[PDB]
Amino acid sequence: SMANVLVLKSSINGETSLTNQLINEFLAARQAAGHGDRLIEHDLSAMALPTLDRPLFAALRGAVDPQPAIREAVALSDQLIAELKASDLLVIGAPMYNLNVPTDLKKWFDLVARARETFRYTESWPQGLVEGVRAVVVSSRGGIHQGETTDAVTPYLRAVLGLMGIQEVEFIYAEGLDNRPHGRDAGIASARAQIARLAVPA
Amino acid sequence: MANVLVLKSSINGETSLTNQLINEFLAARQAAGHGDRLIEHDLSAMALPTLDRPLFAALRGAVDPQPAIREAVALSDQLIAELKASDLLVIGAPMYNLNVPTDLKKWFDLVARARETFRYTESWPQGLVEGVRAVVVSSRGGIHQGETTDAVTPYLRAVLGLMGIQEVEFIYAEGLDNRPHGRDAGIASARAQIARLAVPA
Ligand SMILES: Cc1cc2nc3c(=O)[nH]c(=O)nc-3n(C[C@H](O)[C@H](O)[C@H](O)COP(=O)(O)O)c2cc1C
Ligand SMILES: Cc1cc2nc3c(=O)[nH]c(=O)nc-3n(C[C@H](O)[C@H](O)[C@H](O)COP(=O)(O)O)c2cc1C
Ligand SMILES: COc1cc(S(=O)(=O)O)c(C)cc1/N=N/c1c(O)ccc2cc(S(=O)(=O)O)ccc12
Numbered sequence: 001s002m003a004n005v006l007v008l009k010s011s012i013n014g015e016t017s018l019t020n021q022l023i024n025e026f027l028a029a030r031q032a033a034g035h036g037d038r039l040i041e042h043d044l045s046a047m048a049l050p051t052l053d054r055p056l057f058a059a060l061r062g063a064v065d066p067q068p069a070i071r072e073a074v075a076l077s078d079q080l081i082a083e084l085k086a087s088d089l090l091v092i093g094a095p096m097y098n099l100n101v102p103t104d105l106k107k108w109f110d111l112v113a114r115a116r117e118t119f120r121y122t123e124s125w126p127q128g129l130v131e132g133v134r135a136v137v138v139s140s141r142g143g144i145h146q147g148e149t150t151d152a153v154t155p156y157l158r159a160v161l162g163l164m165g166i167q168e169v170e171f172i173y174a175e176g177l178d179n180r181p182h183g184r185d186a187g188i189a190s191a192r193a194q195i196a197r198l199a200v201p202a
Numbered sequence: 203m204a205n206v207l208v209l210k211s212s213i214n215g216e217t218s219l220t221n222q223l224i225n226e227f228l229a230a231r232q233a234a235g236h237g238d239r240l241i242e243h244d245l246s247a248m249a250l251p252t253l254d255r256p257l258f259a260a261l262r263g264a265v266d267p268q269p270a271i272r273e274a275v276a277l278s279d280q281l282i283a284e285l286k287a288s289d290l291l292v293i294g295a296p297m298y299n300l301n302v303p304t305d306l307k308k309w310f311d312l313v314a315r316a317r318e319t320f321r322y323t324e325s326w327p328q329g330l331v332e333g334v335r336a337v338v339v340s341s342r343g344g345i346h347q348g349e350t351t352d353a354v355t356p357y358l359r360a361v362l363g364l365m366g367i368q369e370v371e372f373i374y375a376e377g378l379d380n381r382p383h384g385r386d387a388g389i390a391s392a393r394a395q396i397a398r399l400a401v402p403a
């Protein structure tokens with residue numbers, strides 16, 4: 001009855017990382033609420049994920065490319081698509097970096113959002129092929145953006161996950177960390193309160 | 203006259219529609235009497251490094267004697283000096299999985315820089331790039347104008363505004379993968395946006 005949780009960490013701050021700190025605190029809170037978790041942990045920061053270019057996009061679509069480096073990336077694309085389809089809970093660390101997600105997290109979506117694999121084109125809108133997967137997004141920010149137009153990370157993550165079928169996303173925000181005194185403490189405290197709510201639905 | 207910095211980011215190569223419409227936009231400007239000097243960048247081919255811990259530290263001004271790091275520090279210097287000396291920034295940014303192409307985001311990750319293009323002050327960090335507008339070329343396989351699924355638009359407005367580029371125009375080619383003539387109506391629409399936006403010099 002153990003949950004299958006795929007953990008994607010994309011911060012570059014190493015040990016100092018807050019989205020990764022809040023991911024761990026969120027994981028323990030799930031255990032502290034009676035959940036046995038099976039974790040596949042991917043530090044996207046240190047995996048050197050490949051970038052999507054014209055040759056790689058064709059092998060991901062079908063074309064024969066007997067390049068050792070391109071054959072290896074399609075293998076990585078398949079394993080990542082396999083892990084995501086096999087899990088119950090996708091937990092994404094998405095700190096705001098220059099008003100976008102971190103590049104390595106974007107590279108993951110580039111290798112995981114694939115036609116015939118995670119979605120398929122319908123006469124109307126693409127249909128997702130990932131079934132029964134929840135998404136919880138940790139996202140610490142410098143200033144505060146949730147609600148306003150300058151927040152691009154939030155509507156981005158919703159659209160790209162929904163394209164693949166994950167129409168269940170829940171955000172743990174930690175905005176306002178640039179204000180040295182209260183700002184950091186309040187945003188973290190708000191996230192830790194959001195954590196305690198989200199660590200219950202199992 | 204106008205100093206233009208054209209940024210191409212599509213991966214389709216010579217079949218790229220954004221690159222075609224970037225050209226169609228620049229020719230229509232010369233038709234309206236605008237003689238541009240161009241710095242041209244196909245970010246697909248320059249293999250821009252990814253933002254990581256040591257590079258960000260070096261880009262922030264820290265002493266980082268690492269060789270490969272120092273080169274990307276120079277790549278940020280040169281990429282910013284072009285932008286600061288420009289009059290018109292033209293961006294090709296088609297929707298790639300509801301974000302922008304990765305090779306574009308890496309340029310922003312190198313051009314959005316503290317004590318260079320933006321400065322933190324009490325309240326919101328203020329911009330440091332003066333005299334620059336922006337025209338974004340963005341084609342999409344589906345209809346995303348005005349919807350929540352469009353993050354390219356609010357991201358580009360936000361990240362260009364962060365460094366001071368406030369006037370940003372958008373040229374859209376929506377629903378290019380429709381059964382009847384979605385590719386046609388989308389391009390013809392963007393061409394109607396070509397003719398309007400090419401005038402203001
Ligand atoms: C490279 C970099 C870029 C950032 N860009 C933004 C930004 O555009 N807007 C913002 O509000 N905060 C920005 N921040 C602040 C982060 O959101 C904040 O540091 C957050 O805690 C990072 O979480 P992490 O340590 O898990 O990466 C940026 C931080 C870094 C390191
Ligand atoms: C890798 C890739 C991802 C794409 N993702 C989207 C998408 O998420 N939504 C959409 O409407 N169209 C998407 N498209 C279709 C493009 O928007 C369309 O093909 C556009 O005209 C590409 O222009 P370009 O040749 O300059 O790259 C995608 C195309 C590619 C190649
Ligand atoms: C582009 O960068 C930023 C953009 C904006 S905004 O667009 O106006 O919203 C804001 C409000 C802040 C930003 N600075 N971000 C950091 C950074 O660049 C480096 C180290 C940091 C260390 C910490 S901290 O954890 O040690 O406290 C916190 C933040 C940063």
Ligand SMILES: COc1cc(S(=O)(=O)O)c(C)cc1/N=N/c1c(O)ccc2cc(S(=O)(=O)O)ccc12
Binds near residue numbers: 163
């Ligand atoms: C996540 O990917 C997508 C999401 C959506 S969405 O859910 O509705 O937002 C849509 C509508 C299309 C998408 N991908 N489409 C292409 C693609 O994957 C590869 C090559 C293409 C070449 C051309 S073309 O210009 O040469 O005809 C056109 C489209 C593609």
